[PDB]
Design a protein around this nucleic acid. Sequence first.
DNA 1: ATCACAGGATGTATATATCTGACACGTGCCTGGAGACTAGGGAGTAATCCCCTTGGCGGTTAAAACGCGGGGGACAGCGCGTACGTGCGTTTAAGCGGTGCTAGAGCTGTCTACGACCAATTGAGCGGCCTCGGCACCGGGATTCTCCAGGAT
DNA 2: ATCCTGGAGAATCCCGGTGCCGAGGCCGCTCAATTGGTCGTAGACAGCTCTAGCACCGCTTAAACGCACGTACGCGCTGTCCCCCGCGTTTTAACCGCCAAGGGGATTACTCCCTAGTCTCCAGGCACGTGTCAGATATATACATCCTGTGAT
Lengths: 83, 81, 362, 96, 96, 93, 94, 107, 108
Amino acid sequence: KVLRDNIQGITKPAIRRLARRGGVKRISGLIYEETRGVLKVFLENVIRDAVTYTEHAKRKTVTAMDVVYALKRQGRTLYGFGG
Amino acid sequence: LRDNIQGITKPAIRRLARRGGVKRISGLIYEETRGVLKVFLENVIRDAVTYTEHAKRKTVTAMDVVYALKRQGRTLYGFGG
Amino acid sequence: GASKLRAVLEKLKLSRDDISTAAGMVKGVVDHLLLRLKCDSAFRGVGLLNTGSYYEHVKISAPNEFDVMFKLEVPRIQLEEYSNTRAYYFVKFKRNPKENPLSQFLEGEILSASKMLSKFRKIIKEEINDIKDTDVIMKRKRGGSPAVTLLISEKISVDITLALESKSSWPASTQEGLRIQNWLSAKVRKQLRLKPFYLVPKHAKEGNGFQEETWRLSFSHIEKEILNNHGKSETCCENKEEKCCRKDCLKLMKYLLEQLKERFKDKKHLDKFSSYHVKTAFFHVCTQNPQDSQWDRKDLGLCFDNCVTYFLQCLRTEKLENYFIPEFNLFSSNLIDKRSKEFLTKQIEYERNNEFPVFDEF
Amino acid sequence: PHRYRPGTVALREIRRYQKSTELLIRKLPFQRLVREIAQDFKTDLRFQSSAVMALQEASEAYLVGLFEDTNLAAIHAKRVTIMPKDIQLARRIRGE
Amino acid sequence: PHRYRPGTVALREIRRYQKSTELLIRKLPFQRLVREIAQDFKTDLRFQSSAVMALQEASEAYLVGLFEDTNLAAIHAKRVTIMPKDIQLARRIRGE
Amino acid sequence: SRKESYSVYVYKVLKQVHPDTGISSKAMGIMNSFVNDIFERIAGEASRLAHYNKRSTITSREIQTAVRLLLPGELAKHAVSEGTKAVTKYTSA
Amino acid sequence: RSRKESYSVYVYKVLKQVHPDTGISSKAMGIMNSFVNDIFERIAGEASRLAHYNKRSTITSREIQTAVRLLLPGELAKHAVSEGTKAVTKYTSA
Amino acid sequence: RAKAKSRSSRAGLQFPVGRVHRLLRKGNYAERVGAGAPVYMAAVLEYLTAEILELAGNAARDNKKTRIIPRHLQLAIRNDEELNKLLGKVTIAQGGVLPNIQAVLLP
Amino acid sequence: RAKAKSRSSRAGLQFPVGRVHRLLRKGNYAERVGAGAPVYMAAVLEYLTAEILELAGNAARDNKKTRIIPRHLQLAIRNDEELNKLLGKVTIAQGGVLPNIQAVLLPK
DNA sequence: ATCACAGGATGTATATATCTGACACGTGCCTGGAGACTAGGGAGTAATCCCCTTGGCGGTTAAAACGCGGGGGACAGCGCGTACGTGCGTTTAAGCGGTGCTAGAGCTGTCTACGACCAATTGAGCGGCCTCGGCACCGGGATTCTCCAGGAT
DNA sequence: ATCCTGGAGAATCCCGGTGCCGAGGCCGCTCAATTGGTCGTAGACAGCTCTAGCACCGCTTAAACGCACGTACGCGCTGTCCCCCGCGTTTTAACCGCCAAGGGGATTACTCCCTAGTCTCCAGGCACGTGTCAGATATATACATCCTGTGAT
Ligand SMILES: [Zn+2]
């Protein structure tokens, strides 16, 4: 019941496709590692707030609203998953 | 009143730049800098005016400026609050 | 009564004209050690307390005995008073976002004096073996005040004290201390209290055992500052018209105790007494006599006699308040037994009645 | 041996990925990453499929926006290739 | 005819201006700038002296922060001199 | 139970602008998120203005001011024009 | 001529526990007042939201606690929680 | 007994007024909400709603459709500076991005 | 009637409890405020207040002063990573900035 | 031709004495906090229903991973020249302070139109249902791209 | 080395048909909007006080302005190299559809008890007043850092 090393589940092509969508044409080899190190931080901050909201409500299952509130307060908002 | 943007002296700009750690300043910075300061002021002043007018006042108070700044992601401490 | 004292003082000073080389040897060893400590992750911030000097002589009659302090900054600490002792505390660390490198010395919440001392000794012991031109030996432990005692060739000894530095408001137990207001002024007192205080590894020992991980408050730097800035005029002694005997009286008081301790070091009666007691008593006498005219150099004889009398009163009544921590009795029966005080009382009284012959005899 | 030159495909892919709306990160891999992170805050957590998708879209949108700023930094330096430091600069300016 | 070399004084000034807290923009000039802008929204408007100061401090804080990011951009480009571009890039990355 | 949304009102507006245009369930979900987001902000500022000026009541005036503080450019203006009318008529209705 | 509220008196007292021998300028005090009102509003604001989200009419010590965690970073948030948890534990026991 | 009549009709609006009034009076915005506030607000929400839908409908035709999808909302918003600004921090599910390519990357 | 006692003293706090109890009611943060909410919050505000004042006091001592000025508050807040962020968007009147000079600008 | 040193020049930090106005502390209110009391609605608890998340299986398929060759960009090094920095001398208007005017903030007291509140009635909107039509996907053909060879520059 | 057609070879657009499942319209019903009357108080309004923001004057003087010298920096050009890109072949596990189990979210019914709202009384906290100490200012002395000559290497 213990997960590990799923950070490499974010594959090289996946990173590139995101980069290309952003208009990036050419990517240095060291980007793949650096990019994951940023994605992860983003997720830690968002997931944690979502968990915090979930715990407050005394639930186990994280719902879309828990995520939306978590994202919202970090200087953004996500449309289409509720409200 | 007119063109008081020129009241922001060159040294004044440089000193701000220095405080930001800027060692050398291109000669075209001075105009570019003004073009940014002015926009900043227009947005802040206008909100302060909006609050002032709403309250049916003519004098803009520090609190109207603080509210104006606040909402732009900028709380200012030391002038009430 | 001053003439005999003046001859003694001259003798004591002249014995130190030889030191410049001894101080050199101490410096050689100290600089070497500091390099290693700076290489060690735990002691990377270590440095000398008495900045600009590699020597300080606590004992006036021991010119070959040096005392140096290696200080280590602790950026925020929480003190917890040990058993109402007013001088002993546990050291804990406050919230600190960044990594605190002294974490390796923690035991639960508390900074372990034992661990820090053990490693301090470890680093030095391995490092002195890298002193090649000078033979430096580490002596066996006798306590934590001197963390380390080094034996340098056949002439020099160095007592090394490790201290934590805290640059924050002194503990409340010091609130009524440093009673220089009527002597050096209230404004000087305030200036001094803006300076850091120090904590030295020291087990809080009692009759039935001891508390291993306690630290004791230290104000040695302030004591030094006062002695070298003992006037309300400040440049007192920088000119003859203001030459006082405060410094002379302290040397003589220290010398009296040290000479007697040396005389009777074999009978062990005086082992628990130190120059710190003398120095503390001295500051109290200075507080009682705040005017420079009460310390005119011409009155050395009576000033010293009166200093002796105060010290005797403290011994007899078993009371000597820490100058910075007034509820800390340095002469409590719990720290020094009556037998030692009665013995010292008698020896001092004998000396004083015979114009202090112990000052000449060795 | 017929083929396209370096940069021809890259520009093409930029067009295509900008155009489409689907997810670019594989789902099961992403989903597991979310949980691996989540388990460090608490064990025995569960997610609705809508929660995972909400996290994923926000995550991609974040990275894509980051890459846009990264690309500009590389251009400012007179380059085409993005390097780890172009990412770091963009973030620093943002205030992260 | 003693001289300091280029950059010696500039570094000195950086130390000092970072250290001090006082306003660097002259007041009467600044005050008028505020008013000229204000009159374009409304005539016969007034300000408290504390309102003008509040604007001035916020204005300088803004520009200093802008210059810090501008400086980083210039360094990224391997330059010491800041150019209009370095200002423009920093602002853009910040969402302006 | 029974949820509530603006799906029905959004749908109608779409007809006013594009009588022959349909809409996906997701686009509708997005429009619902949008309406709630804008509502909250305006209501939020109106709350604050009433507080700042030491009042208990939110009136059409606080809403008007809130609109300007939140909306850029002319959107704020056209919104004010429409808001003014709706109130003007409702009152005379 | 209206009584104006501030935390100036409470700020002084805290200052005495941390630094018994020091004072504070009127400006620094004005800043501390701006600071307290800022933090107060945020926590009260988030606590309001939590009550709304979870369908409640009341703010309790939990909404405050959760609000603290969401608003404060790292350990700073934790110590605030520890102190709060205690103050309540004691208050209701005193 | 007068017949019940929707306020939305009185104000010439499509958005509900009574509901908005309800939401405003609670959700903790104020102790009290004036009669004209819900009306003013309903008109504003409706105005903005129309602008997005109108522009999205146009985007739908650029893609030759008769329907609005999340993408059309994204294109409608980001090609209008004022809406883009109002919603400048909004992430829209399945919105994608604008097809912007820097000139320096081109032949 | 029994003798009245201040709640701040009771909770071991310096910050007012009754006042916070009240302020939590306004802006309609909630229809209702629970008994333990004012206390929990007062403790939090006091904790944060202490951290800033303590660190600022340390800065004041480094500069050989007997008090805190706006600048000392700024230095304390920014040097402390967690306080830096909490107030990461705050402009302090007369705060100045940290003396950070980029290494690439220095000669050698 | 480069290193480092010593001297001068300059600017900084340092102790010193004096000044003043901004803090720290004390006094006298006075109104908001705290105690005491009832009333009733919200939050807590448990029942329990059933929806949705989890885990597992097997097939297939696109997508990833790996390796190889080769062009193209990143980088370091060089030299030109000009656009900034530094210091000097002259000009400007900022800052200080002091005066005088009154416009508009801020508070008081009165009165009444407005909105909370409550009880009754009902139809606008939400959930569940069926229907079929616009969109996604398949396969084939048209034509619109990129790139190299060979013949001009 | 670089420009100009003309062909070969993919890749991308357009055309027409299949078929499916998600939108869109209809029916029941139920509970949230509307109406209608009562109460009381928040806000509108007028009046008055008097703070403080505007305008003006003259003097002192530190900043700003403009110019001249010269050199460190930005910029463009060249060549090296290595490190990404693009393609093809092999390997992996993501995705899909189907199945079963049961954990936990959502709703229900019921009951206190924990709060809001009320009245009474007093001391904690704010506005004002007064005294003196900390920090600012200014003087003068001594130490630290920077930049040319110059002699040693
Ligand atoms: Zn003396």
